[PDB]
Design an enzyme around this catalytic site. Sequence first.
Site, short mmCIF file in Angstrom:
data_model
loop_
_atom_site.label_atom_id
_atom_site.label_comp_id
_atom_site.label_asym_id
_atom_site.label_seq_id
_atom_site.Cartn_x
_atom_site.Cartn_y
_atom_site.Cartn_z
CE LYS B 86 -3.86 -2.16 0.07
NZ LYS B 86 -4.66 -2.27 -1.08
CD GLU B 108 -10.49 3.40 0.64
OE1 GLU B 108 -10.41 4.85 0.31
OE2 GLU B 108 -9.91 2.52 -0.01
CB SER B 376 0.42 -8.31 -0.88
OG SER B 376 -0.51 -8.94 -0.20
C1 LIG Z 1 -1.39 -6.57 3.45
C2 LIG Z 1 -2.45 -6.68 1.97
N1 LIG Z 1 -2.38 -7.52 1.09
C3 LIG Z 1 -3.24 -7.43 -0.02
C4 LIG Z 1 -4.26 -6.68 0.27
C5 LIG Z 1 -5.38 -6.50 -0.87
O1 LIG Z 1 -5.56 -5.26 -1.69
P1 LIG Z 1 -5.46 -5.19 -3.29
O2 LIG Z 1 -5.95 -6.27 -3.79
O3 LIG Z 1 -5.61 -3.51 -3.55
O4 LIG Z 1 -3.78 -5.25 -3.22
C6 LIG Z 1 -4.46 -5.92 1.25
C7 LIG Z 1 -5.70 -4.82 1.47
N2 LIG Z 1 -5.84 -3.72 2.51
C8 LIG Z 1 -6.75 -3.12 2.49
C9 LIG Z 1 -8.33 -3.41 2.42
O5 LIG Z 1 -8.62 -3.81 3.56
C10 LIG Z 1 -6.85 -1.99 3.36
O6 LIG Z 1 -7.86 -1.16 3.79
O7 LIG Z 1 -5.85 -2.03 4.42
C11 LIG Z 1 -3.68 -5.73 2.49
O8 LIG Z 1 -3.93 -5.04 3.50
#
Ligand SMILES: Cc1ncc(COP(=O)(O)O)c(CN[C@@H](CO)C(=O)O)c1O
EC number: 4.2.1.20
Lengths: 256, 394
Positions: B86, B108, B376
């Site tokens: 992220k 969000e 991820s």
């Molecule tokens: C560690 C990790 N790996 C994968 C994802 C998947 O999100 P993506 O499909 O946009 O990559 C998330 C999403 N987490 C988002 C949705 O809940 C958040 O608001 O924190 C994540 O935290």
Amino acid sequence: MERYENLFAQLNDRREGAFVPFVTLGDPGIEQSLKIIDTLIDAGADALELGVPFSDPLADGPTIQNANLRAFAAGVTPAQCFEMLALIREKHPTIPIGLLMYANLVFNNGIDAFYARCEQVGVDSVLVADVPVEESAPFRQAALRHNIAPIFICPPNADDDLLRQVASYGRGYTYLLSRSLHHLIEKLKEYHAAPALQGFGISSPEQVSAAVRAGAAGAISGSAIVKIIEKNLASPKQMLAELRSFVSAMKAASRA
Amino acid sequence: TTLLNPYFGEFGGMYVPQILMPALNQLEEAFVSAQKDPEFQAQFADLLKNYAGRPTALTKCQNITAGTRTTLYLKREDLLHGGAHKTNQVLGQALLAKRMGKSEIIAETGAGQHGVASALASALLGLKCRIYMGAKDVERQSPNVFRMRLMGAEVIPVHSGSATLKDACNEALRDWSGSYETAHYMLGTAAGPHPYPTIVREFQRMIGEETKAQILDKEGRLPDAVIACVGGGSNAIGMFADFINDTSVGLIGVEPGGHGIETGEHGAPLKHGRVGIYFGMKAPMMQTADGQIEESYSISAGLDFPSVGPQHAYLNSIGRADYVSITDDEALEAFKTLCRHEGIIPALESSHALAHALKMMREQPEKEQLLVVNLSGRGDKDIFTVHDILKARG
Ligand SMILES: Cc1ncc(COP(=O)(O)O)c(CN[C@@H](CO)C(=O)O)c1O
Ligand SMILES: c1ccc2[nH]ccc2c1
Ligand SMILES: [Cl-]
Ligand SMILES: [Cl-]
Ligand SMILES: [Cl-]
Ligand SMILES: [Cs+]
């Protein structure tokens, strides 16, 4: 076939603006909702804007968010909403009935099939809250194929290209969200847009009179009705009574 | 009119209230301009390298694949500042916000990882940050909530609706519609109205760009397949993007299968939902037969976005990428397996990708295949959930 045009002709014949309350179908329950709308009409509503409860009304404030939750707590579904729309139309043949919809409820069973059901139950207009004029083509096409007026919001941050599009694509009435620079209202008249209804901040008779004086064809109270319902959940009969007194107060204010 | 195509095939668009169209048109113009601007790219590269810690490693798993002819590499976005991928795109979006003269951030979050990234980016860059989070997610994610607040962010619980991520998404849009003159909506996945699916992809695509250069350097060839979990789609499209034109490279997205697709308690709308219009886009979604949007279910909090980026739905429709699912139990076993054999605690989200790679390897152990899994995030946030599941059994 012609309900908004007929209403606006008559209102102009009588030196009058339209007053259009909004309410959510099935809030706080279907029979009480039916009672509420009948009271709105008997009190002087010139047209109705009706919301169908949607899980994610990303364009609505909290008063309407709570209204959807009350309707969902009553088990209200779109199907039942259309049963209400049929019954309302069969009681009141001339009142224009507009829906405020979210795109997914329109898209869900097919767009054309949604507007076909609107025509079956006697709906006159549909505003799809989350479809800007730029994405509207499939929606307004289906609307017109079924003699539904597609309603568009003219927002306060509107530029000239949008005013042209709203004037060209809209029908029935233009939903205006503004603080009436009636620059917007005059350019909409200029581009022969559908008659503009002012929908922002209409919660007192003073604002109904003010919108008409600015040149709007009338005013929509998007929240105040729902507030009166929310406050009077304990007593259905004081709810109907305060609805009637508020709506006639508002309607009497449109007599300029 | 727009500078860029809002649609991926039939999916995407800009399904927002009219009042928000100028905010989206403003954002797209700033993005297109930023992408042509060397000084923007240098600032972005600087933050990624010197603050977030890129390039991340590409780690070969040799214990995992022993006895098979699979070679497995992990793209270590778990080693990024913040612990998840992220961070890449919030740094880019935060620089976009400042390029547009904005001083506030709206975000969000569901699991809290996007909230935490948004808060750390806002802190670094001098932006006031407010974060919307469903009241049930706030309840359940107090560590991430405390992290956000330590970093100066305002965390606002959203009680409307189901009180989960989709309802926080709604409130964030509501807020932005009145505040967009001063606030930038930092959307957390490669979904939503145009231009967000495009912007997130371009601000995550260094994942796949680094992977390509690293895999060419280590193996002399492109991978047979890159594999990533799909919540809203950002980490997967970030990994995919630089391989899309490398047609010999398989692209595999893994949605959460939850308790199993046939139970209905899953979060796999791309393959098992139904196209709808919501959150500014036309995309597959978790919805009732009535068209009311539902939640995604998964053991992993991060895969809770009830829809999927429209570029993924498009990639699926033309057959360029394949999408599968993995149940809670498969992801959990993959979690344990990586801890025990590589000493890497993966996020339960990324555990879905790994779980699918393990299935590929185990199902056909003599198939020669070079796989990259996008890790991820790190799984330290998940050990409490994993602990409670293990003690519920034994
Ligand atoms: C560690 C990790 N790996 C994968 C994802 C998947 O999100 P993506 O499909 O946009 O990559 C998330 C999403 N987490 C988002 C949705 O809940 C958040 O608001 O924190 C994540 O935290
Ligand atoms: C970008 C990132 C990582 C890399 N390793 C070898 C080349 C290269 C390029
Ligand atoms: Cl490094
Ligand atoms: Cl091996
Ligand atoms: Cl392949
Ligand atoms: Cs999802």
